[PDB]
């Protein structure tokens, strides 16, 4: 937040509340039994999507 | 008993002129060796 | 932090002295004249200037190649 | 071990970085288009034809994509895209239903290693396969609905190679003239300009062998119909002017980079300017007049380089792709321009732009006609991105 | 008020950007 | 028949513990190892002589808040490494390899907290998981597939609590808050066909999801035994043991004394009680008893810190036994008891993140 203390600048910071940071990949890998997740060593098929 | 020097620079620039030089070395003040150099 | 390595005397009135630096980083050793001595016992440099190739030596997590074992071409 | 732990870490880091780049994009591009395919691709080619329906705000273009699935049926595909062709228009920008759609599927035996349409006939394209031969097809002769059986008309395959490869180049001036390059350390040349008795069997007219390493790429001249070079892991570029009749000793041969050469491209607007690309993480260039001069070096990629492509519509604009999950854009005009220390810590001047979209080894990219400044990119993560940089950067 | 809460919370986001600082710098 | 406090310990987080499990897969002679799980930590110790116990290892989960509930020791047929799996309120099941000090497998398919884990006495890849979801699941921990789901139109209606394999491993009992105790079978043809199938499936092979087995019917049940919760049952050869908050442990058999166990008709509507056991101050639920691998003695924790011990011998349950080994330090409560493969030592957990040890003097 911008406070503008008279001395030139002041910013009172606070933590984000949500910040939706979660894996953005094949949404399935999240649950592969460990050791196989993030294999990144063989093509895999998934549903098609498109964003703008 | 080990010692090392390199001859050139990345610009193919020699780093070694001729003259009598005093150098030390390490094993695996204290031990040292002197020598000269000449470009013939 | 630099340390004198080799003490070479030029045939002329010069004695170049070899320097190496404690972090053992990308940097190469350097030949120094006794006149410039006591002036570069330690050096500090900004990061954007360092030798690119051997900059990675600080950390594997600097940059990798995720396949790390390429199967196809 | 260690590498596993380390890779987990690196993955999480890359995820964070992509999060940031996404959050930051809006102030950076004039277009952002992302779309996920079921199976990834290894090809990229913009069809040289464009249609623009009226009463709307968007153009229409067709793209040439390959397929390397895991195990199941392979296919050759060409799909549709609705690029906004407007400056005042902006559900999203146009219709609400869809901006991308598949339209062409053809059964394919093995994955696709390469695919380019013939300059004289876009209905003619080539194909590099896991096998030791070449396939050609004309989509207009097959239904989009694929043969549920499987393999179908190879449409005049070729012959003359013994291991697979990746080189592919029609001769622009001369029809039928097409070059190849495979692990055979050889360059095979068919001429399908006239094969009445197809039989799906044509052997290469001429087979050149001057490299003693696995060849990597080959490209025709852009003005001459009798000129082309060669690229292998020999780190030796050899100039092959045909009609001299020696498949052993070319016209010229020098060492290009200290590492194996991968990609190669000529400037369209010039006559002599060559663009070279190697594993050296370097980018060099040459001229047909004299060759014993590495003209310049771009030194910011942090891994191998696999593709270089000049810009249509722009004489002095080039593009460098590789494995570093990055993509560069250079500038031949700003060679050694005094910049502020903050401009310098940003980077050297001649480097113009760096793409920050993909999160894997960038498989392939392409300029397009019909549009000034846009390039599509394909990674190994089933990912297709199309964008347009912001305008302000230039001018 | 075990101020370690204020500490532990704002502890987390810091090191991340910290690493990121160096990384991006190179 | 005399144990003595030769050691007692205490944690630091002070949050109550629940689990105690010797590794009953000790190649003869190997040291005594046992573990215990608390709020969100696990603990590895080793029994030493002279009442010495040595801390070995400990892990913790931070990324959420959970109160771990149970554990179980097994091994790997492939390389014979010891194997321990645990689960808590979040309802997830983890599988840890101490040899590498890592978790290699995690399972998430329930809807509530889990309450107990046991294995088939013979097969080491069959894990039974009892939950509050009224559904008792059963996994092939090796091919990563579910097998059965017991519960449905005729299942338990409220928060299954405890289960127990038969001695041979083809029959199960279940008990939960609804005063209800139901019998399941495993020996059925269908069941074992299913199991064998489970041991054979490649996901890459088919486009099909593996097909589990749903079972909607107990083989037999009743609620006539207790008029309160039931939270721990034990197979007794072919007899039954169960406890309630009514401060008495009971032994019975279904049907009549003449009624064989393996002829019982599903519509059986009678049970035979044999005897009762007695104690004092178990006026809360979630408290368990255990028994020696040789099925000769009985241990039981207590609310006020006491103990009560019997013998599984010819001692007539009318006047079988009475043995209370006591100490003056903690009387908070004691959740669970545990013996070694032999009857050497006996551990129990107090409610205050404090351990106890009792060394037998026969
Ligand atoms: Mg994992």
Cα within 13 Å of Cα(F52), Cβ side:
6
Question: Per the CB < 8 Å rule, is F105 touching A34?
Answer: yes
The DSSP element (H or E) to which D6 belongs, if any, is helix D3-24
Interface membership of B17 toward C (CB under 8 Å): yes
- Report the largest interatomic distance among the alpha carbons of chain E, rounded to a whole angstrom: 41
Contacts of D296 (CB under 8 A, 6+ apart): D284, D285, D335
Judge contact between F188 and F204, C-beta under 8 A: no
| Rounded Cα gap, residues D16 and D36, in angstroms | 20
CA angle F81, F83, F84 (to 5 degrees): 160
Q: Ligand 1 centre from F87 Cα, in Å?
A: 18
Q: Which residues of C22-43 are buried (b: 16+ CB within 10 A; e: fewer)?
A: eeeeebebbebeeeeeeeeeee
Name all chains with 3 or more CB-CB pairs below 8 Å to chain C: A, B, D, E
SS3 label, residue D25: helix
CB atoms within 10 A of CB F156: 25
Which of B15, B18, B23 is closest, CB to CB, to C7? B23
Are the CB atoms for D309 and D318 separated by under 8 Å? yes
Phi, psi of E11 (to 5 degrees): -55, -50
Ligand 1 centroid–CA F57 distance in Å is 23
Structure tokens belonging to residue F136:
């008792």
F105: CA distance to ligand 1 center in Å? Answer: 9
Which A residues in the span 6-25 are in contact with D, Cβ-Cβ below 8 Å?
Answer: 21, 23-25
Distance E17 CA to ligand 1 centre (A): 24
Which string of b and e fits F315-324 if b means at least 16 CB within 10 Å?
Answer: eeeeeebeee
Report CA-CA distances (Å) from A8 to A11, A12, C48. Answer: 11, 14, 31
CA dihedral F140, F142, F145, F149 (to 10 degrees): 10
Distance (angstroms) between ligand 1 centre and the Cα of D133 equals 41
Q: How far apart are CA B9 and CA F207, in angstroms?
A: 62
Q: Are F306 and F326 in contact (CB under 8 A)?
A: yes
Residue with tokens 């062709």: D85
Q: D82 in helix, strand or coil?
A: coil
Which of C41, C33, C35 lies closest to C17 in space, CA to CA? C33
- How is the beta sheet containing A49-51 ordered, strand by strand? A49-51, D29-36, D383-389, D375-379, D362-366
- How many Å lie between the alpha carbon of C67 and the closest alpha carbon of chain A? 7
Separation of D8 CA from ligand 1 center, angstroms? 9
Residue A26 CA, ligand 1 centroid: distance in Å = 13
HSE of D42 in the Cβ direction (CA atoms, 13 Å)? Answer: 20
Helix and strand totals (H; E) in chain A:
0, 1
| Closest-CA residue to F44 (of F30, F60, F63, F29) | F60
User: Nearest Cα to F117, choosing from F85, F148, F95, F145?
Assistant: F85
> What are the structural domain ranges in chain C?
10-73
Q: Find how far residue D70's CA is from the centre of its chain.
A: 22
Question: Distance, CA F212 to ligand 1 centroid (Å)?
Answer: 25
DSSP F30-99: PPEEEEEE-SSBEEEEEEETTTEEEEEE--B--SS-----EEEEEE-TTT--EEEEEE-TT--EEEEETT
Is the Cβ–Cβ distance between F272 and F318 less than 8 Å? Answer: no
Q: Please list the helix, strand and coil fractions of chain B in percent, rounded to the nearest 5, in that order.
A: 0, 25, 75
C62 touches chain A (CB under 8 A): no
Give the strand pairing for F345-350 and F239-244.
Answer: unpaired
Around Cβ F235, how many Cβ atoms within 10 Å? 17
Q: Report how far ligand 1's centroid is from the alpha carbon of B13 (Å).
A: 52
H or E segment at F197?
helix F189-198
Which of F149, F95, F147 lies closest to F117 in space, CA to CA? F95
Give, in degrees to the nearest 5, the angle at Cα F228 between F241 and F171: 35
Strands ordered across the beta sheet of F213-215: F114-119, F126-131, F136-140, F145-150, F213-215
Helix (H) or strand (E) holding D231: strand D227-232
Return the residue of C nearest to A42 by Cα.
C71
B with A: touching (≥3 Cβ pairs within 8 Å): no
Q: Are D231 and D270 in contact (CB under 8 A)?
A: no
Task: Give the phi and the psi of residue D112 in degrees, each rounded to 5.
Answer: -105, 125
- D interface with E, Cβ–Cβ < 8 A, is 13, 16-17
Distance CA F13, CA F16 (A): 9
**Chains contacting D (3+ CB pairs below 8 angstroms):** A, C, E
Give C9 to chain A, closest Cα distance, Å.
Answer: 57
Closest CA to D228 of D195, D193, D189, D261: D189
For chain A, what is the radius of gyration of the CA atoms? 21
- Tell me the sheet residues that pair with D79: D63, D102
Q: CA torsion F198→F200→F203→F207, rounded to 10°?
A: -90
Tell me which chain E residues have a C-beta less than 8 angstroms from the C-beta of A15: 9-10, 13
Contact flag B20-C9 (C-beta cutoff 8 Å): yes
Q: Are strands D29-36 and A49-51 parallel, antiparallel or unpaired?
A: antiparallel
Number of helices and strands (H, E) in chain C? 0, 3
Among residues F177, F175, F173, which one has the least CA distance to residue F165? F173
Nearest-10 crossing angle of helices E4-25, D3-24? 90
Q: Which two tokens stand for residue D84?
A: 């906004």
Q: Which residues of B touch C8 (CB under 8 A)?
A: 17, 19, 21-23
- The DSSP letter of residue C47 is G
Under 8 Å between Cβ of D72 and D93: no
What is the 8-class DSSP label of residue F311?
A: E
Q: In what helix (H) or strand (E) does residue D5 lie, and over which residues does it extend? A: helix D3-24
In A, what residues contact F, Cβ < 8 A? 31, 33-35
Alpha carbon dihedral D15, D17, D23, D24, in 10-degree steps, equals -160
Which pair of tokens denotes residue F21?
Answer: 């499990």
Cα–Cα distance, F309 to F279 (Å, whole number): 10
Task: Determine what percent of chain D falls in helix, strand and coil, rounding each to the nearest 5.
Answer: 10, 35, 55
CB of C71 within 8 Å of any CB in chain A? yes
Q: Which of D9, D14, D16, D324 to mutate to test the interface with E (most CBs of E within 10 A)?
A: D16
Number of Cβ pairs closer than 8 Å across C and E? 11
For residue B37, give both structure tokens: 């150099």
Q: Which residues contact F230 (CB under 8 A, 6 or more apart)?
A: F161, F162, F175, F176, F179, F180, F181, F242, F243, F244
In whole angstroms, give the CA distance from residue F86 to residue F42: 9
For residues D355 and C45, give the distance between their C-alpha atoms in angstroms, rounded to a whole number.
29
Find the Cα–Cα–Cα–Cα dihedral F87, F90, F92, F96, rounded to 10°: -50
Q: Is the Cβ–Cβ distance between D58 and D93 less than 8 Å?
A: yes
Chain E positions touching D16 (Cβ under 8 A) are 16, 20
Contacts of C40-49 with C-beta under 8 Å, sequence gap 24+, read: C40/C2, C41/C1, C41/C2, C42/C1, C42/C2, C43/C2, C46/D345, C47/E22, C47/E25, C47/E26, C48/D344, C48/D345, C48/E25
Picking from A25, A37, A38, A41 by the largest number of C CB atoms within 10 A of its own CB, the best residue to mutate is A41
Helix (H) or strand (E) holding F273: strand F271-278
DSSP sequence for D321-387: EESSS-EEE--SS-TT----HHHHHH--SS--EEE---SS-EEEEE--SSSSS-EEEEESSSEEEEE
What residues does B24 pair with on adjacent strands? B32
Pairing of strands D327-329, D319-322: antiparallel
| Through-space distance between the first and last CA atoms of chain F, rounded to whole angstroms | 5
Token couple for D236:
């030796």
CA angle D216, D125, D377 (to 5 degrees): 65
CA A52 to chain centre: 18
Pairing of strands F310-311, F297-300: antiparallel
CB count in 10 Å sphere of residue F87: 29
CA of A32 to the centre of ligand 1 (A): 6
E16 touches chain C (CB under 8 A): no
Q: Do F108 and A31 touch (CB under 8 A)?
A: yes
Angle at D209 (CA atoms; ends D207, D211), nearest 5 degrees: 145
CB-CB contact of F201 with F193 (8 Å): no
Residues of C in contact with D215 (CB under 8 A): none
Q: Do strands D125-128 and F230-236 pair parallel, antiparallel, or not at all (unpaired)?
A: unpaired
Q: How far is E20 from chain D (nearest CA, A)?
A: 8
Asked if D85 contacts D59 with a C-beta cutoff of 8 angstroms, the reply is yes
Distance (Å, whole) CA E8 – CA D122: 62
Between CA F21 and CA F340 the distance in angstroms is: 9
D110: its two tokens? 């093995």
Instruction: Give which of C28, C31, C38, C39 is closest to C15, Cα–Cα.
Output: C31
Distances (CA, A) of D140 to F68, F77, F228: 65, 59, 79
Residue pair F321/F310 in contact (Cβ under 8 Å)? The answer is yes
- Residue with token string 């959740």: F335
Residue of A nearest to E11 (CA): A15
Give the three-class secondary structure for D18. helix
Q: State how far the Cα of D137 lies from the Cα of D204, in Å rounded to an integer.
A: 17
Measured between its terminal Cα atoms, the distance across chain C in Å is: 44
**How many Å from the N-terminal Cα to the C-terminal Cα in chain A?**
30
Which residue in A38, A48, A52 is closest to D36 by CB distance?
A48
**Interface membership of D360 toward C (CB under 8 Å):** yes
* Interior angle at CA D93, CA D89 and CA D97, nearest 5: 145
Exposure letters D380-392 (e unless 16+ CB within 10 A, then b): bbbbbbbbbbeee
> What residues pair up with B33 in beta bridges, in sequence order?
B23
Minimum Cα–Cα distance from C63: chain D residue: D10
Which stretches within chain E are classed as H helix? 4-25
Residues 6+ apart with CB under 8 A from B11: none
List Cβ neighbours of D131 (8 Å cut-off, separation of 6 or more). Answer: D109, D110, D164
Query: How far is CA F15 from each of CA D73, F8, F43, F85, F115, rounded to the nearest angstrom?
Result: 58, 16, 13, 21, 18
Q: Which residues contact F310 (CB under 8 A, 6 or more apart)?
A: F277, F297, F298, F320, F321, F322, F323
The strand pair at F145-150 and F213-215 is best described as parallel
Using CA atoms, how far apart are residues F88 and F69, in angstroms rounded to an integer?
5
Chains C and F touch (3+ CB pairs under 8 A): no
In contact, C67 and A40? CB cutoff 8 Å = yes
Q: From CA F112, how far away is CA D133, in angstroms rounded?
A: 59
């Amino acid at each position: 937040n911008y406070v503008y203390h008279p001395k030139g600048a002041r910013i009172d910071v606070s933590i984000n509340e949500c910040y939706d940071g979660s894996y953005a990949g094949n949404p399935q890998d999240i649950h592969r039994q460990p050791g196989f997740a993030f294999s990144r060593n063989g093509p895999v098929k998934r549903t098609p999507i498109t964003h703008i | 008993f080990v010692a090392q020097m390199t001859v050139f620079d990345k610009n193919r620039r020699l780093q070694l002129l001729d003259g009598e030089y005093e150098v030390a070395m390490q094993e695996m003040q204290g031990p040292t060796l002197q020598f000269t150099l000449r470009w013939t | 932090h630099s340390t004198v390595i080799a003490k070479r005397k030029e045939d002329s009135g010069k004695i170049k002295l070899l320097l190496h630096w404690m972090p053992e980083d990308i940097l190469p050793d350097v030949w120094v004249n006794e006149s410039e001595r006591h002036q570069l016992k330690t050096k500090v440099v900004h990061l954007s200037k360092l030798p690119k190739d051997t900059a990675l030596l600080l950390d594997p997590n600097i940059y990798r190649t995720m396949p790390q074992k390429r199967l196809k071409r | 071990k260690e590498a596993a732990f380390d890779d987990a870490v690196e993955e999480r880091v890359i995820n964070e970085e992509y999060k940031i780049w996404k959050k930051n994009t809006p102030f950076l591009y004039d277009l952002v288009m992302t779309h996920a395919l079921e199976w990834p691709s290894l090809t990229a080619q913009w069809l040289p034809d464009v249609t623009r329906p009226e009463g709307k705000d968007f153009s229409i273009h067709r793209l040439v994509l390959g397929t390397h699935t895991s195990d199941e049926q392979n296919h050759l595909v060409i799909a549709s895209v609705q690029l906004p062709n407007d400056d005042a228009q902006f559900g999203g920008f146009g219709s609400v239903s869809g901006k991308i759609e598949i339209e062409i599927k053809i059964n394919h035996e093995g994955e696709v290693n390469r695919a380019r349409y013939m300059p004289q006939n876009p209905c003619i394209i080539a194909t590099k396969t896991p096998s030791s031969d070449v396939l050609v097809f004309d989509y207009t002769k097959h239904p989009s609905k694929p043969d549920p059986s499987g393999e179908c008309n190879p449409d005049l395959r070729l012959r003359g190679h013994q291991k697979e490869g990746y080189g592919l180049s029609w001769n622009p001036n001369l029809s039928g003239h097409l070059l190849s390059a495979s692990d055979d350390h050889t360059i095979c040349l068919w001429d399908i300009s006239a094969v009445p008795k197809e039989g799906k069997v044509v052997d290469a007219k001429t087979i050149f062998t001057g490299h003693t390493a696995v060849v990597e790429d080959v490209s025709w001249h852009l003005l001459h119909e009798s000129l082309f070079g060669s690229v292998a892991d020999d780190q030796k570029l050899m100039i092959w002017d045909t009609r001299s009749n020696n498949t052993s000793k070319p016209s010229h041969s020098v060492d290009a980079h200290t590492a194996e050469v991968n990609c190669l491209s000529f400037n369209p607007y010039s006559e002599f300017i060559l663009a070279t690309g190697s594993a050296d993480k370097t980018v060099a260039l040459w001229d047909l007049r004299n060759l014993k001069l590495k003209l310049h070096s771009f030194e910011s990629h942090k891994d191998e380089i696999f593709q270089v492509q000049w810009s249509p519509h722009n004489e002095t604009i080039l593009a460098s792709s590789g494995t570093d999950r990055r993509l560069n854009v250079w500038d031949l005009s700003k060679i050694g321009e005094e910049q502020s220390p903050e401009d310098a810590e940003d980077g050297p001047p001649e480097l113009l732009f760096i793409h920050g979209g993909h999160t894997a080894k960038i498989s392939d990219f392409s300029w397009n006609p019909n549009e000034p400044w846009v390039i599509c990119s394909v990674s190994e993560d089933n990912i297709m991105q199309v964008w347009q940089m912001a305008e302000n950067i230039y001018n | 008020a075990d101020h370690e809460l204020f500490l532990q919370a704002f502890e987390k986001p810091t090191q991340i950007y910290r690493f990121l600082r160096t990384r991006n710098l190179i | 028949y005399s144990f003595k406090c030769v050691n007692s310990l205490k944690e630091d987080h002070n949050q109550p513990l629940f689990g105690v499990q010797f590794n009953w897969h000790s190649k003869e002679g190997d040291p005594l190892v046992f573990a215990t799980v608390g709020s969100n930590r696990v603990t590895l110790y080793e029994c030493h002589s002279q009442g010495e116990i040595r801390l070995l290892q400990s892990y913790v989960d931070a990324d959420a808040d959970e109160n771990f509930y149970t554990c179980a020791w097994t091994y790997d047929s492939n390389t014979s490494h010891p194997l321990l799996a645990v689960a808590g309120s979040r309802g997830i099941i983890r599988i840890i390899n101490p040899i590498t000090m890592q978790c290699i497998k995690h399972y998430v398919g329930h809807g509530n907290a889990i309450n107990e884990l046991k294995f088939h006495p013979r097969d080491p890849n069959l894990l039974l998981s009892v939950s509050k979801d009224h559904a008792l699941r059963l996994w092939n921990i090796q091919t990563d597939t579910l097998v059965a789901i017991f519960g449905g139109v005729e299942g338990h209606r409220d928060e299954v609590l405890s289960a127990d394999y038969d001695l041979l491993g083809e029959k199960i009992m279940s008990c939960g808050m609804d005063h209800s105790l139901k019998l399941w079978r495993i020996n059925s043809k269908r069941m074992m066909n299913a199991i064998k199938e489970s041991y054979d499936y490649n996901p890459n092979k088919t486009n099909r999801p593996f097909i589990s087995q749903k079972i909607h019917f107990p083989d037999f049940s009743t609620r006539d035994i207790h008029r309160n919760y039931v939270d721990c049952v034990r197979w007794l050869g072919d007899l039954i043991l169960s406890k309630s908050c009514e401060n008495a442990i009971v032994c019975w058999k279904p049907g009549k004394m003449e009624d064989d166990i393996d002829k019982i008709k599903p519509s059986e509507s009678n049970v035979t009680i044999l005897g009762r056991f007695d104690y004092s101050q178990c006026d809360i639920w979630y408290m368990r008893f255990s028994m020696d691998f040789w099925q000769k003695m009985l241990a039981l924790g207590n609310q006020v810190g006491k103990l009560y011990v019997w013998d599984l011998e010819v001692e007539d349950p009318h006047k079988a036994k009475c043995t209370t080994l006591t100490h003056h330090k903690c009387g908070a409560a004691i959740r669970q008891t545990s013996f070694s493969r032999d009857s050497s030592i006996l551990i129990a957990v107090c409610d205050d993140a404090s351990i106890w040890r009792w060394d037998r003097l026969r």
